[PDB]
Symmetry: D2
Subunit: 121 residues, 4 copies
């Protein structure tokens, strides 16, 4: 199959992505219900010629949490790897930075991890 497709986490997120031949990732990141107000633009990059030794495919993407409905003044980046096969998976670590004053900059960034599969919950 491949990176292109509809992916889901176990917490209520869905993202739809196209992986371009030369490394582009473009798509939408949304809630499980998928209403317009919860949909945000996603853009990133992936290694379009991964190693031929069984290693995963490195990738990353960003979502700024602003759309035509809402603005959280924040952005998340996910850095991870795609692993193909019967149950394709994208394993990531992420950073969510909020726009803050200088006084609050020390606590501007959340960190976490998330795994996505193409299985709809």
């Amino acid at each position: 199959a491949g990176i292109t497709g509809t992916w889901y986490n176990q917490l209520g997120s869905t993202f739809i992505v196209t992986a371009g031949a030369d490394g582009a990732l473009t798509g939408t990141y949304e809630s499980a219900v998928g209403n317009a107000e919860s949909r945000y633009v996603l853009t990133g990059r992936y290694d379009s010629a991964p190693a031929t030794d069984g290693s995963g495919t490195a990738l990353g993407w960003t979502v700024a949490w602003k759309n035509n409905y809402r603005n959280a003044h924040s952005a998340t980046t996910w850095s991870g790897q795609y692993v193909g096969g019967a149950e394709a998976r994208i394993n990531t670590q992420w950073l969510l930075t909020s726009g803050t004053t200088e006084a609050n900059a020390w606590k501007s960034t959340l960190v976490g991890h998330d795994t996505f599969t193409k299985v709809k919950p």
Copy 2:
């Protein structure tokens, strides 16, 4: 927009050339002074195109997959941070560098760090 658009350097001597689009897109090229990297790489990301007008920074993020026509490190870095405008413009970030690995080495796939970018002119 104009605030983010331009040439930036980090504390290691890396170069980031970016254009901030009216729709929240970040596009440009990145040249790393460190790691398994040579020449320029494509970058893509997102920023908050309508930040708060309260002295808060502008949230943003971008990705570089470390493949270009000259080298392939089978890895990708995401930078998550905020742009702080004014006379002394800076982009303060935290980053995640993920390498494609086998499943047994996935626990040690990701490096974390922090870069401060200073705007040229």
Copy 3:
């Protein structure tokens, strides 16, 4: 039950910890086989009076990877929360810093996540 006990991850780690009444965490971190050469001292802290609203118990600990047999010139810290109940769990994020030269300091720190339970694999 509680934090005190023998915990395991899904990758071949085991740790034995005592949680003191006033917040101390003290124990041993080792491989699944548990031979002397893979055993390292663990020390940390936990919140000894967690919130009474269903929230997890915050904690953290460190292992420096030096014992009487080996020295990797590195140290890992785990930051997370303990969640009690029938299948007690400790959910963590971790940072593994290696001692490096100044030239390699940018790539000194790995990041990851791990979950532990009291179930022996």
Copy 4:
């Protein structure tokens, strides 16, 4: 040993008083200039007691659970980093601040950042 032992301050004005034991223990107190914190808190950690003698830093880590006799923030911070000796002694760290949360808010339990500690005298 003597290199690490002493009083340190970070870029935010926080105070770290530590004793490095011959067995690799770090013990002391921490006073934070930021966050839900007041007065001194116990800290415990570990360091590499036999670092490489090649100009590399000394790996270390420590934890503070944000409970003392005056306040309880139901959170814990771990710092992972390296001590760089000489006339200009520094401890360069990355940290993870985890708060106890309900399961629904666990995704946003952990903040990440970086602190530089400078040794007094």
